[PDB]
Amino acid sequence: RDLKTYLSVAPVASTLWFAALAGLLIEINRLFPDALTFPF
Amino acid sequence: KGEWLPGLASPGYLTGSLPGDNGFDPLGLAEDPENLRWFVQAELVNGRAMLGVAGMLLPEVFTSIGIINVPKWYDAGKEEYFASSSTLFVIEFILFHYVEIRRWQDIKNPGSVNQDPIFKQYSLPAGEVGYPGGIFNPLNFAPTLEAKEKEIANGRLAMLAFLGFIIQHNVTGKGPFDNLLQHISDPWHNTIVQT
Amino acid sequence: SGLTPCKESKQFAKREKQSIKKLESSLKIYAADSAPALAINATIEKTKRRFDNYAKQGLLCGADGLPHLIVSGDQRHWGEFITPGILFLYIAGWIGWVGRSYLIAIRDEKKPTQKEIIIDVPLASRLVFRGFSWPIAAYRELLNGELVAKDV
Amino acid sequence: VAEPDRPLWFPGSTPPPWLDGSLPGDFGFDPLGLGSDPESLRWNVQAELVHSRWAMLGAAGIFIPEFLTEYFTDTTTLFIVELVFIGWAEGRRWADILNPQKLKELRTKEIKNGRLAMLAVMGAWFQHIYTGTGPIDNLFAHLADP
Ligand code: CLA
Numbered sequence: 193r194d195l196k197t198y199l200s201v202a203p204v205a206s207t208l209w210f211a212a213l214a215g216l217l218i219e220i221n222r223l224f225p226d227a228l229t230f231p232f
Numbered sequence: 233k234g235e236w237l238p239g240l241a242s243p244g245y246l247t248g249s250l251p252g253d254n255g256f257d258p259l260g261l262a263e264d265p266e267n268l269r270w271f272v273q274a275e276l277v278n279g280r281a282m283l284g285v286a287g288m289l290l291p292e293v294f295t296s297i298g299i300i301n302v303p304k305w306y307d308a309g310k311e312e313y314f315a316s317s318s319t320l321f322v323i324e325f326i327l328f329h330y331v332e333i334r335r336w337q338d339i340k341n342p343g344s345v346n347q348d349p350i351f352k353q354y355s356l357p358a359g360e361v362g363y364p365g366g367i368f369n370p371l372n373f374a375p376t377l378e379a380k381e382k383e384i385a386n387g388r389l390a391m392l393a394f395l396g397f398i399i400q401h402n403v404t405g406k407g408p409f410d411n412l413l414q415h416i417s418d419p420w421h422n423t424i425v426q427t
Numbered sequence: 428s429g430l431t432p433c434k435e436s437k438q439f440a441k442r443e444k445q446s447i448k449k450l451e452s453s454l455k456i457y458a459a460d461s462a463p464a465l466a467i468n469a470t471i472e473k474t475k476r477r478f479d480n481y482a483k484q485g486l487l488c489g490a491d492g493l494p495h496l497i498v499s500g501d502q503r504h505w506g507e508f509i510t511p512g513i514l515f516l517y518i519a520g521w522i523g524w525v526g527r528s529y530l531i532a533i534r535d536e537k538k539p540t541q542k543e544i545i546i547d548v549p550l551a552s553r554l555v556f557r558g559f560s561w562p563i564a565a566y567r568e569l570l571n572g573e574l575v576a577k578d579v
Numbered sequence: 580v581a582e583p584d585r586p587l588w589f590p591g592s593t594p595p596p597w598l599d600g601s602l603p604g605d606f607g608f609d610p611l612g613l614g615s616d617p618e619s620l621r622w623n624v625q626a627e628l629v630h631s632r633w634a635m636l637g638a639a640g641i642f643i644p645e646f647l648t649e650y651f652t653d654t655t656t657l658f659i660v661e662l663v664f665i666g667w668a669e670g671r672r673w674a675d676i677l678n679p680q681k682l683k684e685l686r687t688k689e690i691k692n693g694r695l696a697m698l699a700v701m702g703a704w705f706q707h708i709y710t711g712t713g714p715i716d717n718l719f720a721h722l723a724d725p
Pocket residue numbers: 236246250251252253254255256257261262268271272273274275276278279388389391392560
């Protein structure tokens with residue numbers, strides 16, 4: 193089963209990483225949309 | 233000495249020679265020995281928190297029943313001065329300036345143990361960068377050895393303690409002690425979960 | 428800064444009303460209780476909300492009626508650039524430091540290029556969090572943050 | 580500890596080289612191979628175990644509704660204390676994972692029952708979802724008619 197892991201460790205890694213990154217960013221924007229500034 | 237986690241194991245840099253060694257450096261900042269000798273000094277000076285955290289906590293609980301009528305630690309900006317605030321900063325700065333550099337040399341070369349203007353008198357007699365005996369220790373306590381590990385450990389908790397104080401203040405809008413006692417209003421419902 | 432804040436703005440205020448009326452024009456053909464209905468109304472509250480928030484946080488708004496950011500460093504408007512900027516550099520460095528830390532660990536032994544196209548080494552042993560404290564790379568600078576091969 | 584005799588799931592034949600019946604409960608099952616690496620199996624093993632141990636208890640939750648034919652501060656604290664507690668618990672269990680012939684029987688049997696709860700604990704809910712009805716009575720209540 194070593195094989196599947198490696199398979200998931202090529203440029204696909206990039207897609208999974210960018211999909212995870214996109215999901216994070218979009219969800220952040222859902223909770224805090226129309227953000228023109230950091231006010232805290 | 234001990235280990236922060238049973239597995240994973242201590243690094244080689246964390247020999248145990250240093251007081252308060254527990255093999256906790258997962259990231260790896262202190263890996264270069266020159267790097268440690270500096271971070272060892274920083275941990276002591278930051279740690280010694282203690283002075284302050286106790287300074288912001290204890291007077292807050294001395295004003296518990298009405299023994300003293302002093303403002304909160306986060307309200308002591310003015311007019312806690314017979315000379316106004318801006319006077320004090322410069323005095324605090326200029327002289328602290330002096331003490332800090334002198335302390336600085338001892339980190340690179342120990343050092344500046346001797347007195348200065350003094351016309352005909354003694355000088356500090358000591359060894360070790362982080363801890364200088366002398367009036368710094370008028371009692372002449374025991375530079376041991378375990379305390380050195382006691383010193384740390386208490387300073388480390390104070391640090392986390394400070395981090396607690398400031399955070400908690402925000403949200404709990406008031407005193408880290410009111411805070412403390414708002415929790416005691418029969419907790420189990422008075423948790424940070426509330427906020 | 429000839430701009431007068433989004434609160435006492437007549438244009439930026441007018442712009443809010445113009446946008447929501449157009450949205451309201453659209454729901455008239457779908458009949459409330461319907462799907463395209465909320466979606467339009469949900470869009471309207473977001474519209475009101477973002478206009479409401481911008482006036483709160485300051486934001487000066489020009490004569491055109493749109494907020495203009497001030498990046499001079501003015502303490503009144505730090506949240507418009509500096510504070511987000513500090514946050515960016517943090518993440519920007521973190522990425523930079525983690526990536527650099529990786530290629531360094533790879534170089535000794537193995538076939539180095541093998542690790543570059545395939546990284547069945549994840550964060551190596553545990554390299555990611557090392558970025559939590561990247562700024563301590565200042566101390567890496569005083570030692571060997573740079574190689575001495577070419578120039579100084 | 581090798582044998583071609585173990586009651587395979589699918590008779591004639593079922594022999595994956597990784598599985599051998601050395602382990603307890605080895606009914607020769609894994610077409611996917613979801614663990615052909617010893618690092619792969621040694622982990623799966625522990626995984627397939629702890630699960631079962633939990634599932635059993637879950638079963639012990641199906642034991643209570645037939646005895647009779649949820650908090651002082653709902654969730655929140657109840658969880659953090661749980662997280663904080665089972666954490667340390669599971670904590671050390673983690674550190675241990677990476678650092679008599681009679682007993683084989685016990686452990687072979689332990690897994691199989693354990694395997695049962697999971698299939699069980701599972702069943703009671705994907706029958707409960709979409710289909711608002713408890714399983715409490717169903718054994719002889721649904722046996723009245725298909
Ligand atoms: C200034 C504070 C400070 C400094 C300079 C040090 C320095 C040191 N520590 Mg110590 N430590 C501290 C605080 C500090 N510590 C606290 C508060 C604790 C309680 C957990 C510990 C627990 C600890 C253990 C168990 C060990 C050490 C050890 C060491 C030595 C090796 C590791 C190192 O280089 O540290 C690097 C210095 C830093 C990383 C300073 C910056 C740290 C970041 C930026 C602060 C994080 C802020 C906070 C998390 C923000 C909120 C986060 C959010 C999620 C809420 C070195 C002398 C090891 C040792 O052998 O001692 C001799 C050892 O094993 N420390």
